[model samples]
Target: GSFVEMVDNLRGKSGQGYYVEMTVGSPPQTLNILVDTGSSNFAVGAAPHPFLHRYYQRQLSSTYRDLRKGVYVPGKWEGELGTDLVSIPHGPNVTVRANIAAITESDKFFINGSNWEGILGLAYAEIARPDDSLEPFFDSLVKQTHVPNLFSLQLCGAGFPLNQSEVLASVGGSMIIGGIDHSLYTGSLWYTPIRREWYYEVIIVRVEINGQDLKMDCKEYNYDKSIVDSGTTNLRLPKKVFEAAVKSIKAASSTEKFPDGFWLGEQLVCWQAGTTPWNIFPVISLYLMGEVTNQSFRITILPQQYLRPVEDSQDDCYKFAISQSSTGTVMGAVIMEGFYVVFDRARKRIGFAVSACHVHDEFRTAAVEGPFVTLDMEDCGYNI
Candidate 1:
C-alpha cells in the first residue's frame, strides 16, 4: 500500500531498542511496541509487573477476539492467539484486522524491565505462526491494496549526549512502510538476495577490520545464515569470530588505548574517552552475497558507527559484537545504523545504502509531537 507508518525509538532500561506506536480496538488504545525483524509474531500485553504501564488491556478494546490457541516458543514466548483492529498512527491512518498474540505468559528474561508494550514482527509469514498460514499486520495491509511489499528502516545511532531525561525523550529514527525514502540514505543501494525467508537471512562473504579479514568461514561457523535483526542492539557473532574481530581492532589502533581498569562486559567494549574514534579506530567491512550472480556487496561500518560515547561519561565504547557460543552472527542496529535497510519481500531481496544520519533541530522538535512523525516533511527530521 502507498500508506506509510513512522516507527520511533523507545529508550528502555538499557537504552538500546526502538519501538513504534500503534492503536488497538474501537476507541484506539495506543501502545508502544518494539519493531523486530528477527521474530514473526505480533504480541501485546506481555510486559510483567512494575512495567505494567506498557501492558495492553484487552477489556478496553471492543473488537478484541480471543482465539484461545496456545502459541508457544521456548525462551521467546508463550501466548494465546487473538484478532483485533490494529491501527497504525500514520498520515491518513492505516488499520488492519489481523491475528495478534495476547501474551498471557512470557520469558521474563526477555520482557522484564523493558518499556515496550509488546513486539511487532516484521519478518516473513513463514516464521510468524505455527502453521505459517497467518499473515502479519504489514502483510495483511499489502493484500488490501496499494501497500507495496517493502519496508525501509532508518535507525539512528546512539552517539548523542545522554541526559537521562533527554535520552528517554529522544526521537531516534523512522520506519517507512511500503516504499523507500531516498533522503535518508546516500549512494546507490546494494541489493542482496535472501538465503531464506526466516529472519531476513543473508550470506556473509567476509568481515574485515582495517583491510585485514577476520576470516569468517561460512562452512565452519555458518556465516551464510547471518541475519539483519533490528531487534538486537549489538552485532552478535560466534565466539571465535568475536574474539578475532576484537583482537584485530585492538591491533589496528595506533594511539587509542584501552584503559587499565577496562573490563569487557555484555554487549559493550569500553575505553576512557580522549581521542577521536573516527581518526583512531579501524574501518570494519562486512561483505554480503549480492543479488546478481557471482557478485558480492560490502557494507562498511565506520568507527563512529561502531564506537559510541557511553551514557554519562567521556568513555567511548563499541557494541560487544560477541555472542553466545552457538549463536550465528546478527547484524544489529550498531552496524545497521550506518545504512538504510530495505526489506523487499516482493523479490525476496534486501537493499542497503549508506545512511545520512546526523543530529538536527528539526528532529528535536518532532520528538515532542508524538510517537509517529512522518519524515518526508521538514517537521520530522531523523536525528539521534
Candidate 2:
C-alpha cells in the first residue's frame, strides 16, 4: 500500500496524472526525468554516450544536472495564438503557453520498455520552437490567446472505462469542423491524400476479409501510414501484415477465450464476443486528403488472446513490437475506444464518429462521476 500511498490512493481515485521529473547532467551533472503524457515525444536516454552500449540499466538521480543545454519551466504558464481564418471552423485555431524545458538532444534520448526518463510531446507547440515541442508550446497559445482554441486530453486508466475513458484535446476534439463519430461508424468518413512526412497519408482502397478482396501486395494506392493514437494501447500490426492478420483472425474466432498479454509493450489481439459477427470480417478503408474528407472504415476481427503480457514477458509474443517500417497502421487506444476521435492538426486531417454506444457503460458512468479516479489492484486486492 505504499508508493506514496499508491499515488495518494490513485490521486484520490483517478484524476491528475501530473509529472515533471528530470536529471540529465554535466553542469554538476544530474538525471531523473519524467513527464510523460502517455507519450508523444520528448526523449532522454543516458547522456554520456559516444557509444558504449548498455540498453537498459537506468537508475541515475542526483538532482538537477546539465551539460550546458537548457532546462527549467516549473510552472505558471497559460496559452493561445492563431493563423488561418477563413471563418475559423476547424482549420486554424492555435493557443499556446510556455516555460517547460530540459532538452539537450543526445539524439532525443532513447529507451522504451518504460525504463522512463523522458516524454512530454503533448503535440501542438511547447516552446514556440525552432524545436523543443508542444508545437512551440501551442504556438505561444495561438499568437496570444485569441480564444476558441482549446485542447484537452484526459486519460485516467485502470483500463479506461470509468467515465467514458476521457481524452479531449478540444475545439470539441477537432479534426476540422466535420469533427466525427457518427455513431460507431458504418458509413461516411474515408479520406486520403496527404502524401507523407509525419501523418495523414492514405490510399489502400481495399483489404476486405469476410466480404473478400484480400490479395494485397500493393501497386497503386500508396502514400500509406496513418496514426490517431490516444496514447497507444494496441493495434499496431505490420509485421508482414500482422502475421497474415493474426492468422486470419485465429481461423475465424469462435471465442476460444483469447486473452494474451494485453498491450503494455504492444502485440495485442484481444476480443470479447457479445455475439460475434465481428463486423463481418472487413472494411478498413482510407482515401483521405479532401474529397471533403472521403470515407470508409470498419475493421473488427479481434481475438487472438487479446495480447496482454507486459514486463518480464510470460509470452503474448513478448508483449508487442512489429514494424514493417510502419507506413500505415496504428489506430491504438483499443481502436479509439468505441469512437469519437478527431485530430485536425490544422487540417492535416483526421476524423471519426460514433460514441453514444454503451462506451463500457458510458465510461463506467463517466468514471463513477468524474474528477478523475481509478484504482485496480485486480479491482481491490492490492499488493503491488
Candidate 3:
C-alpha cells in the first residue's frame, strides 16, 4: 500500500476514531493526529488542558518556527499558526515541513477520554479558520511532496452494534495519503461530483428506511447543504428531515419502541447483555446525486451502523446515531463505517465503495447502489 511513502497506516480508537502517527518538530514530538475533513487547520495541543493528557511545547522543537503571533476562531477557539517538520511515519515515510496550527486555548471542542491529540484538517482553504492564509497540512503535504491530490479513507470498528456478543475495542482501518490501498476496499466505486471546494459536499436527493422513501421533499435532504464530514460523529440531517427519518424508522421497526429523546440522543436505550436487539432496527439509506443530471446513488447502512453503543452503560445501551442540524445534512461516521470513502480531489468527485470491514456476507453487507433517475427538482443543493 505504499505509493512512494504516501499511505498512512492509522488505527481507529474508542469513541473519537482513526488517526495517523506524526513525529513533528526537530527534536521529534510523536503525536497521534486525527485526520479530519470537516475542518481546515492542522491544530495541535500547545498548552495544558483539563483532559489532554500531554501537550506540545513549541520551545522543545528547534525546527519549530512561528509564522503568526496570534489567530482567533471567534468564541469557540483560539490558536497560533506556525511551521514545523512533520514526519508521518509508517506509510508516509517522508518528513514534510508543514503548516501546523497550535491550539493555544479552546472551549467545548476537546472531549474527555479522547485518545488523539491533534487534528490534521484535510480540507480546502475556503474553510481555513482564524487566518485563511494558513494552508491545510494535507494540502501542504501534496504540493510540497508532489504526491497526487486523491486521498482514500477507511473507518471501521468505531460503531457499537448490538448483535456481537463481544465487540473489539474497535480494531478499524487506515488512510492512504495521496493514494488508495486497493486491498482496503472491494468492488467498484460510485462517484458523485464535489458540490463545493470547501467541504466534501454532494447533492443529496433523498432518504429512505427499509427500501421505503421517507416521503419528504427532495430538496429537504440538502436544505442548506449535504456534506460528507469525517470530523462529525452522527449522520446529521436538517430538522425537518431528521423528524421524518425518525418517524419512518419507528414505523419500520415492529419489535421495539423508544421515545423521542432516544431518537435525538437525549436518553439512553439499553438491552440485556446477551444477543443484541439490533435486528429490531431497519436499514437507512441516503441518496446522493451523480455527475450527470437525473442520475443518483444511494448508500445504505444496516442498524448496526446507525446505533452507537453508550460508553460504560451497564448493559448494551445504545444511542441513535442520527441527529438534527440546521446548517446542512451531514454524512458522518454513522454512514461511513460501512463504506470506504475516496476523497478524489484530483477528479473533483467523491467515491464510495464497499469497505473490507463490512464486506463479508455473515457480517451483513453495506450498500452503495444506483444511477437511479432523480427527480427533476430545482436546485436540490447549495448553489456553490
Residue range 1-384, candidate 1, lDDT tens digits: 222335443343123467777777777788877878988888887445455565667787899898868787775667778888887685225688878888777655245445567788988888877658867877877876676788888888656445556656777677787778787776778887777787787766667786687764443334335688888866666677777877787778746666423314344555578544455667777776676555666777766655444543567555433343345778887666778789988889999887777322221211100112112121111112
lDDT of each: 0.66, 0.32, 0.77
- In model 2, the runs with Cα more than 4 Å from the true position are 1-98, 101-113, 124-227, 235-251, 255-330, 333-347, 350-384
Model 3 spans with C-alpha error above 4 angstroms: 1-8, 158-170, 312-314, 359-364, 375-378
C-alpha-based local distance difference test score of model 1: 0.66
RMSD of 2: 20.3
lDDT of 3 by residue, 351-371 (tens): 998887752235557778887
TM-score of each: 0.82, 0.27, 0.91
Q: Give the TM-score of candidate 1.
A: 0.82
For candidate 3, give the lDDT.
Answer: 0.77
Clashing pairs in 1: 1-146, 1-147, 1-148, 267-320
Q: After superposition, how far is residue 81 of candidate 2 from its true place, in Å?
A: 20
| Number of the predicted model whose TM-score against the real structure is largest | 3
Candidates in order: C-alpha RMSD to true structure: 9.2, 20.3, 3.2
Residue pairs with backbone atoms closer than 3 Å in model 3 (clashes): none
